[PDB]
Design an enzyme around this catalytic site. Sequence first.
Site, short mmCIF file in Angstrom:
data_model
loop_
_atom_site.label_atom_id
_atom_site.label_comp_id
_atom_site.label_asym_id
_atom_site.label_seq_id
_atom_site.Cartn_x
_atom_site.Cartn_y
_atom_site.Cartn_z
N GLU A 89 45.26 29.32 35.79
CA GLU A 89 44.53 30.39 36.44
C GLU A 89 43.21 29.80 36.92
O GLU A 89 42.94 28.60 36.78
CB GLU A 89 44.32 31.62 35.51
CG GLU A 89 45.59 32.44 35.32
CD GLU A 89 45.40 33.87 34.84
OE1 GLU A 89 46.41 34.48 34.42
OE2 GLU A 89 44.26 34.38 34.88
N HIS A 101 47.97 52.48 33.28
CA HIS A 101 47.11 51.42 33.80
C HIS A 101 46.95 51.36 35.32
O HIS A 101 46.11 50.61 35.83
CB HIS A 101 47.42 50.08 33.15
CG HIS A 101 46.48 49.85 32.02
ND1 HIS A 101 45.28 49.19 32.21
CD2 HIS A 101 46.51 50.38 30.78
CE1 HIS A 101 44.61 49.35 31.08
NE2 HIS A 101 45.31 50.05 30.18
N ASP A 137 48.25 39.09 31.88
CA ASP A 137 47.08 38.66 31.11
C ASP A 137 46.77 39.69 30.01
O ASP A 137 46.07 39.35 29.06
CB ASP A 137 45.81 38.64 31.99
CG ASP A 137 45.86 37.77 33.22
OD1 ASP A 137 46.55 36.75 33.18
OD2 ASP A 137 45.07 38.04 34.17
#
Length: 460
Positions: A240, A63, A127
């Site tokens: 958030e 990632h 997330d």
Amino acid sequence: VGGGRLSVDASDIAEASRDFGGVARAEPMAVFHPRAAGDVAGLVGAAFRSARGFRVSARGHGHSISGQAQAAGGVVVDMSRGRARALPVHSAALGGHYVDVWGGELWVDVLNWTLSHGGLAPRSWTDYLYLSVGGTLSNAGISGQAFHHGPQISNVYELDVVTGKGEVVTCSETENPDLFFGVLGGLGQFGIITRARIALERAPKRVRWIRALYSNFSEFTADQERLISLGSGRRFDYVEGFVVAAESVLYCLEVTKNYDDETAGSVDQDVDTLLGELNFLPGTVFTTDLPYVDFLDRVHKAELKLRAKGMWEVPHPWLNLFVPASRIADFDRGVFRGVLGGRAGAGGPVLIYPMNKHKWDPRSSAVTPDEEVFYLVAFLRSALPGAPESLEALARQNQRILDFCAGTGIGAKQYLPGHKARHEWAEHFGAARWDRFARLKAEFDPRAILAAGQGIFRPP
Ligand SMILES: *Cc1cc2c(cc1C)nc1c(=O)[nH]c(=O)nc-1n2C[C@H](O)[C@H](O)[C@H](O)COP(=O)(O)OP(=O)(O)OC[C@H]1O[C@@H](n2cnc3c(N)ncnc32)[C@H](O)[C@@H]1O
Ligand SMILES: O=C(Nc1cnns1)Nc1ccccc1CCO
């Protein structure tokens, strides 16, 4: 090498040569598939003893944005590939449960395992769950829960680490603390995590997920800052926000309230009381009620929709910054209303939310701004596929943002830094932290074998 195998399979090499960023393409000589921690030690030990040395990098789920998990002419350790799993354990000293996980385990698999063995779950999240434990622990691992429980690096009791000398070391706050705190947020520089002992809590069953709109940045950030100061006590369990593209700028607050069978009767009154104290635009409250797992895995559902539209495997010139709360208004003015001119121009979501520095252990290698409250500002950009001008424009927009921060003395710090320049790393860390980082490197990876893709130390 032991039970593990070296692979020169074309598909293995190709995957180990790429990451989510979709730009960096440094090919390794081979991909190592370990069976256990000892295999990893054997491989690293062989690199440390070799005459020339060779680069060794652990890969989680790949990632990384800029070749951090890549090892040019070396060996990429595929940690996340399926290869005995420890059950959660209760400690009367810790006052809760922990679980031992393989360093390459994805957070999604940790979650499924802990829920199935006692209805337990990690307290601090990202997330997106298709990230490895060792990968996020080498950075910080942040989401909307970090203001309260701290990032994932504040929710680990112990590690087993294979150093750059090929030595398996068990470390924690009370055992080899220099390695433990060095590795947490350490960008893979001091060793490969083969085991992490994760803190757990009893998972809620359901989540009340809320979004609300703001047109005034001062009121939006004042509400986020008030919400993250709660629970020292009635609070939201996640906070958030994001900058809304109007096609005058809008901001969206995102909060949740967790519940189970017992608390279901008080959830609606708790949410109403908390919302009634906020200053969002009236009639702009959007609510969803869903199981806990479905909320945690929300980003994966969006991924599936993007893959189907051929909009996943595209370059991702991301920029993640930690901005001190004292300069967030100047940032909004200079960047959201300046550099962006209030315009979709970002090439994807722009996340914005504050956190509490006191939840971050000051002994870890993680770099945060020199202020108690700071924001994560995440430019989660996607370049258009087959359009080189799209990646050029977004990379230039990232450079302008960094130049605006440096030029106006905003003490911002990059999260998942992509510096690759000595004086810039020294500026990132600051004198005291840089000296400690270099000293840890001389101690644990003197030959700079590990995570050379980070581009901090001169590798072989
Ligand atoms: C792609 C992505 C990333 C992401 C995210 C959503 C998506 C779609 N959401 C995040 C979030 O909500 N919060 C957060 O903190 N990060 C988020 N990210 C970024 C993600 O954390 C990073 O990309 C991170 O690197 C983890 O990803 P991954 O597990 O895939 O790891 P990697 O890219 O292969 O390697 C990262 C670096 O760590 C070293 N490494 C890898 N495994 C280990 C082990 N076991 N021990 C030590 N070092 C390790 C790599 O060599 C590399 O330097
Ligand atoms: O990538 C995400 N979230 C996603 C939502 N939809 N697609 S991605 N976060 C992230 C990515 C990189 C660094 C830090 C963060 C944490 C922000 O909370």
